[PDB]
Amino acid sequence: HHHMKTLYTIGATATGGRNGHVKSDNGVLEFEVRYPKGLGGANDDYANPEMLFAAGYSACFDSALNLVIKSAKIKTGETTVTAKVGIGQIENGGFGLEVELHANIPGVTIEEAQDLIEKAHQVCPYSNATRGNIEVKLTVSNN
Amino acid sequence: MKTLYTIGATATGGRNGHVKSDNGVLEFEVRYPKGLGGANDDYANPEMLFAAGYSACFDSALNLVIKSAKIKTGETTVTAKVGIGQIENGGFGLEVELHANIPGVTIEEAQDLIEKAHQVCPYSNATRGNIEVKLTVSNN
């Protein structure tokens, strides 16, 4: 039991089996999902849950990074975050993820950049949700 | 781990957040929802991406489990409801209500299927023990 004061909740529904469909409760997100070619699918034309995880994690981390920057009143350029998500088979026959995250923070020193991403990595819910379970390699640049 | 597939995405845009997968298949804007101080509820956000991804991951795993057993069912549905709140480090954490519906089976069969799916789905494996995932099943 992870008791917290819930600030916001959002739902989504998945249907359609192998040729899947996902829709947020409010319709803001709605699209097809399919297995990608590298997992035995027909093509790479559609989204999949691994891609949704990369999209969500990159956005979560960039949002947390910008909150940390604004809280510190530090001048930076516009930040960028990339998330690369891999899937493979794990020990029980299930499947698991691995993640590489990279942030770029223009206009700061590397010490500042490192401090900022360290804090962002504690703020981001995706980082808190995955810590200890999967590999999350996190690096920062200041280009 | 022997990696079978990898996919990337990039987020940028500052106050006008934008996310794009490496291949352009997903590209959309993100903003804070009203409940977290944002202007409205017209945009995606990372909580919504997690709900979409988890529901799809779990439904995919469930269908793989069903097919491996050659069990006849109706079309399944999975809902994921994702909450966010402040946690002990001063940062923020998720919580999930995950519900599957499996038509055409007994509730005991459905429970067995979701228990197996919860070991297959990468989102379940990645988050286990770090967030509460209330997992239930129906057979409507």
Q: DSSP strand E in chain A: where?
A: 6-15, 20-24, 30-33, 80-89, 95-104, 136-141
Query: What single-letter amino acid sits at B35?
Result: G
Fold annotation for B1-44: N-terminal domain of TfIIb (2.20.25)
Q: Is A75 helix (H, G, I), strand (E, B) or coil?
A: coil
Which of B91, B6, B72, B9 is CA-nearest to residue B44?
Answer: B9
Please report the resolution in angstroms: 1.2
Rg for chain A, CA atoms, rounded: 17
Residues of A in contact with B19 (CB under 8 A): 55, 58-59
> How are the residues of chain A apportioned to helix, strand and coil, as percentages rounded to the nearest 5?
35, 30, 35
Collect all residues of chain B within an 8 Å Cβ-Cβ radius of residue A93.
119-120
CATH for the A48-143 domain, from 3.30.300.20, 3.30.390.30, 2.40.430.10, 3.30.750.24? 3.30.300.20
* Shortest CA gap B32–chain A (Å): 9
Are residues A68 and A53 in contact, defined by beta-carbon separation less than 8 angstroms? no
> CA A1 from chain center: how many Å?
24
Task: Judge contact between B121 and A94, C-beta under 8 A.
Answer: yes
**Cα B101 to Cα A39: distance, rounded to the nearest angstrom:** 25
Domain boundaries, chain B: 1-44, 45-140
A–B: how many Cβ contacts below 8 A? 300
